[PDB]
Design a protein around this nucleic acid. Structure first.
Lengths: 195, 124, 86, 149, 25, 223, 98, 100
RNA sequence: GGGGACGGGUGAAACAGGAUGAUCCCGCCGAGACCGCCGGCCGCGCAGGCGCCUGCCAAGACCGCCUCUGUCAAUCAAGGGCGAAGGCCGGGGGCUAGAAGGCGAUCAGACACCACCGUAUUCCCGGCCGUAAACGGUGCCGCCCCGCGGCCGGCGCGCGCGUCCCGCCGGCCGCCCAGGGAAACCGGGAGGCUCCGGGCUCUGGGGGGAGUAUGGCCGCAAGGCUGAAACUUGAAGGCAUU
């Protein structure tokens, strides 16, 4: 409902007993119905397969990466987003992953990820265009819309509040240690402005 | 038998003695700490004077000989040694010091980024 | 019938930039693509990322407004080369 | 001068003054006409039928040994190419560049050669249609060219 | 470059003139 | 030099010994600071790399040797001696310029060479074309077919010579100059060619715990 | 009038040449029009060569030569006397003189 | 070379030899031994691929994959429909690219 | 990590950088461009243009020919495609230079040149734009035309025989006898033209006003393409010589 990326229902033999266990996997682009998704430390490098991050050759786009081994997925889960294998340190058994924001994170080589990039790529390219098109987007997610500006509100309702000329009245930049009701605006801004 | 890196370029000349790996420096001094005129830091006189002070240090550190690595500013510019290079090399020979090997160590580009000055050049 | 082919629905509304962008994306969303599996031009979109062949009957994960995407085409190609190596 | 290039070259073939059959050659008109007919069974094009007669057999000039050219022999037997070979060979080239263009959309140079080759197919077709060596209905389009080959 | 500088001057007059016609439509 | 005797006062010199292949194994003395903090002297000298002319390594014919320079890196500081192993081979910058002359065509190949010891090496190989003995045309330019025949010859020969080679024998092949010579024979048959040699040989990948190999190379004169 | 048939450049059967920069000026100059004098010199001056040669403890090592192709822009070349303005009569001479 | 021959061999077969396009006719022909060569495609559905390769082993009739696509194979046999499996039930002219 | 006082920058400088230890040296590492020297009276491309290494794909000119066809041709409004750089649009990317911006020195004043920092840009993908001293300032196809060279790609001849030699065809070129031209010069044409007529298109008609006005068409824009007049004026210009 709220995800902008497809999910996938994959059936696995019950290793504990006799049935078939079904799991919900963010779909990497290219997963097709009837595909064989292998998982494990002897898995081959194909889209959809889950391999430990150390086992994955470098430069491979990966999705649903675990930050700490055995976490069943934490990073690279949104539409189109991916992480990249950068370096394996075989002396520390750690790997550097390029996070979707471009930050680089050392993670244990025993963490697991799915080969491929999350499907749903290019979703935000389309303009929402209408306010209704956006009402539908957020009804599926949370009560976060429509968004009213504090400047429109009254002094009691918001810190930006209300004067005779709708102004912020003080710098938007607010300290990192501003208390609950005051941390409104740009927070701990290292810089501001277009550049 | 250390390695002498003389970087001779317009603006200043640096004579540095380090040992083979180059990880440790056995003494470094540059022309420009020997002259008060900014124009004369690249000059041969300052470089001769500079090497004489360096010669004292490497003759007190057991550095009997050096292998020279004269380099220009190089990179995507220069590629021709400044006046300081020959002067320092001569001083190294004048104050003892055998020169075991001489090499061109200037950074050179196999293909390059644009040097400054525009397509019309430095119009001075 | 002229410049605004599929964006005539919007009418004189939303501005030219939105309509021009929509014309590229909406044409791609409504297009028929070739099934990798059955090689027939009957893949159409059911939802963003979900594309189903109307002949092959196979559902494949894909780009929101295209069966395949430029980043993903690069990834399959890198994976094959790297897989051939290992 | 080349029709579609600013190139000048002369690499022609010089037919002999003698239009009469050579002495060493021992092939009767029927003997070589039989070879032409069996070569049509292999499907070999008349340019190749003429070459095969020239090198494996010694008949360097067919019209000298026989009284007619290869296609006149074929037309008399009603075994001539339905689409004249020159147009057909251009059509193979147009589809071959078009196939490459399907994989690569950024070969602007390849696209240019297609316009020139296609322009010849149109020019030769109008002559072939006027001469009636081609049915007047015939049209070279492009998208439908794959079927026409 | 007086010819290149004349063209630029002509252009900055034609754009002004095109703006003035647009005010009156 | 400073042990017998302000920063230099607290220092020591730990001699560097080259691989057994080189006739002058002793090469230099490396300055290190006396142990302080968590900075033991041995840890600092453990991975330093020294560039040594093959002339200094084997003292003899400078003309036939001094142009190549070997990079040797400390892998163990044992008994006060910084034992060293191959980190690369290269011809001097003066050799590189001398080889190029206008009027000639240059063939330059690079190959990834795999060793039994687990090192991936890169051979940078340079070749040049020269005038025939009785040639009217002044410029030594070869038609494209010969250049590709030549490119294949170096690639094929390098697989034959350095394909199954291990680091211990490679260092001796690179210092006896046989590989340069086999490449010249292969290219000779195809066309008169000059200066066919390896410009550089660098380690793309070095194996860990290469210490048993280091014993074979730095020591083990028998092997 | 047209001063030179060459047009100051050696471009023949081409429409574009790779740009190079003056070593001194830094002006972009098409490869054909650059002055391009190659120089092979010695790492140290002859006046220092004698003393360096005596200093070396190696058996037979000569001062190693430095090879550089200097490419100059027209203005850089005439100012630094790499090339001279000649008469219409001698402008045709092509052989390297002196 | 091998590709040039592959295109040439199937064009000569279309004009000279007999052949059948399609899976059902192919399963019927291999089983009776009336197939001399069978050419599959890259996108042959996987079960059909295995069945055709087992019954081909059982009849010892050569099965080769085409360089690609039922669509691309179909345009090669000269037709405007996709051909997954084509069977050379007799070659009048040329059968050289049946290599292994 | 080392070591220690300045480093940059220049015509000389100065603003920046440096005991938060810079510069310098080495050991590494990231990212993005870029393809050196070879590299040219080399080559290829329809022009614009084209240079890492491998693999793949389709083409192209030249040449050789006793192969095929049998004029299927030449140039061309209208019409289609392409088209350096800069620019624009929607994304990616962001190293280097760097329009704008800011700045230190100048100088009467420089806001300019020079130094420094730097945004768009540069680079990629999908579209636009349709311009350049887009040049050989030289349309295209065809003919004869004087020697002496060089290079380039085929082909053939000689000879014991070598990247030899002589030719042939095609391309790039130098010098040039006539010939031409107002000369400069061109002579693989700008020759074979007042002795003026092989064919086809384009354009000009003293200098400006003015590539402006206006209408049109086109472009997202910038602008492109088309395109005057009133009016003013005795020269403007070419190439030579003191």
């Amino acid at each position: 409902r709220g995800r902008g990326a497809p999910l996938a229902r994959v059936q696995f033999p019950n290793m504990r007993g006799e049935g078939r266990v079904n799991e919900l996997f963010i779909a990497p682009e290219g997963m097709y119905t009837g595909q064989e998704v292998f998982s494990g430390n002897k898995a081959t490098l194909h889209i959809g397969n889950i391999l430990p991050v150390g086992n994955i050759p470098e430069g491979t786009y990966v999705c649903n990466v675990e930050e700490k081994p055995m976490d069943r997925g934490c990073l690279a889960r949104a539409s189109g987003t991916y992480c990249l294998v950068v370096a394996h340190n075989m002396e520390t058994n750690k790997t550097r992953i390029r996070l979707p924001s471009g930050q680089k994170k050392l993670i244990s080589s025993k963490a697991r990820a799915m080969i491929g990039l999350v499907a749903g790529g290019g979703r935000t390219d389309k303009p929402l265009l209408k306010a209704g098109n956006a009402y539908h987007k957020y009804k599926a997610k949370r009560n976060c819309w429509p968004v009213v500006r504090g400047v429109a509100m009254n002094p009691v309702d918001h810190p930006h509040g209300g004067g005779n000329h709708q102004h912020i009245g003080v710098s938007s930049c607010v300290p990192r240690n501003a208390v609950p009701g005051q941390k409104v605006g740009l927070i701990a801004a290292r810089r501001t402005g277009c550049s | 038998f250390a390695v002498c890196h003389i970087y001779a370029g317009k603006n200043d000349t640096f004579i540095h003695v380090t040992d083979l790996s180059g990880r440790e420096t056995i003494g470094r001094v540059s022309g420009g700490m020997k002259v008060k005129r900014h124009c004369d830091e690249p000059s041969a006189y300052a470089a001769m004077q500079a090497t004489q002070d360096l010669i004292e240090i490497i003759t007190d550190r057991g550095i009997t000989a050096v292998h020279i690595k004269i380099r220009a500013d190089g990179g995507t510019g220069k590629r021709v040694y400044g006046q300081g290079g020959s002067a320092a090399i001569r001083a190294l020979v004048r104050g003892g010091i055998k020169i075991g090997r001489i090499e061109d160590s200037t950074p050179i580009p196999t293909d390059r980024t644009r040097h400054k000055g525009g397509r019309r050049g430095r119009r001075l | 019938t002229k410049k605004v082919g599929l964006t005539g629905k919007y009418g004189t509304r939303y501005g030219r930039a939105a309509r021009k962008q929509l014309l590229k994306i909406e044409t791609s969303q409504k297009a028929k693509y070739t099934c990798p599996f059955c090689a027939k031009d009957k893949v159409r979109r059911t939802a963003c990322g979900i594309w189903t062949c109307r002949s092959c009957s196979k559902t494949m994960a894909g780009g929101a407004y295209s069966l395949h995407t430029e980043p993903a085409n690069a990834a399959r190609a890198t994976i094959r080369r790297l897989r051939l190596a290992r | 001068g080349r029709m579609h290039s600013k190139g000048k070259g002369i690499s022609r073939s010089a037919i002999p003054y003698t239009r009469a059959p050579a002495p060493w050659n021992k092939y009767t008109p029927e003997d070589v006409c039989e070879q032409i007919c069996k070569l049509a069974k292999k499907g070999t094009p008349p340019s190749r039928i003429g070459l095969i007669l020239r090198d494996q057999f010694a008949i360097g000039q067919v019209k000298n040994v026989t009284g007619s050219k290869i296609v006149r022999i074929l037309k008399a037997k009603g075994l001539a190419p339905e689409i004249p070979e020159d147009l057909y060979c251009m059509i193979k080239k147009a589809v071959a560049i078009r196939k490459h263009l399907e994989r690569s959309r950024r070969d602007k140079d390849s696209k240019f050669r297609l316009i020139l080759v296609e322009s010849r197919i149109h020019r030769l077709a109008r002559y072939y249609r006027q001469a009636r060596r081609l049915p007047p209905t015939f049209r070279y389009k492009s998208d439908q060219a794959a079927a026409l080959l | 470059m007086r010819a290149k500088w004349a063209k630029k001057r002509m252009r900055k007059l034609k754009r002004k003139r095109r703006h003035m016609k647009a005010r009156s439509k | 030099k400073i042990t017998q005797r302000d920063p230099y006062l607290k220092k020591e010199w730990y001699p560097v010994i080259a691989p057994a292949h080189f006739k002058s194994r002793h090469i230099g003395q490396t300055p290190v600071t006396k142990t302080a903090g968590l900075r033991v002297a041995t840890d600092v000298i453990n991975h330093r790399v020294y560039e040594v002319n093959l002339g200094d390594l084997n003292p003899g014919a400078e003309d036939l040797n001094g142009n190549t320079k070997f990079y040797l890196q400390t892998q163990l500081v044992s008994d006060g001696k910084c034992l060293t192993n191959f980190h690369g081979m290269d011809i001097t910058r003066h050799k590189y310029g001398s080889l190029f002359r206008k009027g000639c065509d240059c063939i330059d190949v690079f190959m990834d060479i795999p060793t039994t010891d687990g090192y991936l090496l890169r051979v940078f190989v340079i070749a040049f074309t020269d005038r025939f003995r009785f040639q009217r045309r002044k410029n030594c330019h070869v038609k494209g077919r010969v250049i590709r025949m030549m490119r294949a010859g170096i690639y094929e020969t390098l697989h034959n010579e350095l394909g199954k080679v291990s680091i211990p024998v490679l260092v001796t092949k690179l210092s006896n100059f046989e590989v340069n010579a086999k490449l010249t024979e292969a290219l000779q048959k195809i066309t008169m060619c000059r200066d066919v040699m390896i410009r550089r040989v660098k380690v793309v990948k070095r194996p860990r715990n290469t210490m048993e190999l280091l014993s074979t190379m730095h020591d083990s004169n028998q092997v | 009038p047209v001063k030179r048939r060459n047009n100051g450049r050696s471009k023949y059967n081409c429409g574009h040449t790779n740009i190079v920069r003056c070593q001194n000026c830094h002006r972009c100059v098409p490869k054909d029009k650059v002055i391009k004098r190659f120089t092979i010199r010695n790492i140290v001056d002859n006046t220092i060569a004698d003393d360096v040669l005596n200093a070396c403890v190696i058996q037979g090592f000569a001062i190693p030569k430095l090879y550089n192709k200097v490419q100059y822009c027209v203005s850089c070349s005439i100012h630094n006397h790499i090339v001279r303005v000649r008469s219409r009569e001698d402008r045709k001479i092509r052989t390297p003189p002196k | 070379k091998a590709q040039d021959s592959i295109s040439l061999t199937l064009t000569l077969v279309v004009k000279s030899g007999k052949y059948t396009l399609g899976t059902d006719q192919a399963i019927r022909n291999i089983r009776d031994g009336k197939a001399q060569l069978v050419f599959m495609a890259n996108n042959c559905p996987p079960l059909v691929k295995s069945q055709v390769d087992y019954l081909c082993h059982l009849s010892k009739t050569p099965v080769r994959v085409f360089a690609g696509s039922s669509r691309e194979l179909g345009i090669a046999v000269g037709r405007q429909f996709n051909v997954s499996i084509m069977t050379i039930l007799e070659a009048g002219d040329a059968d050289l690219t049946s290599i292994l």
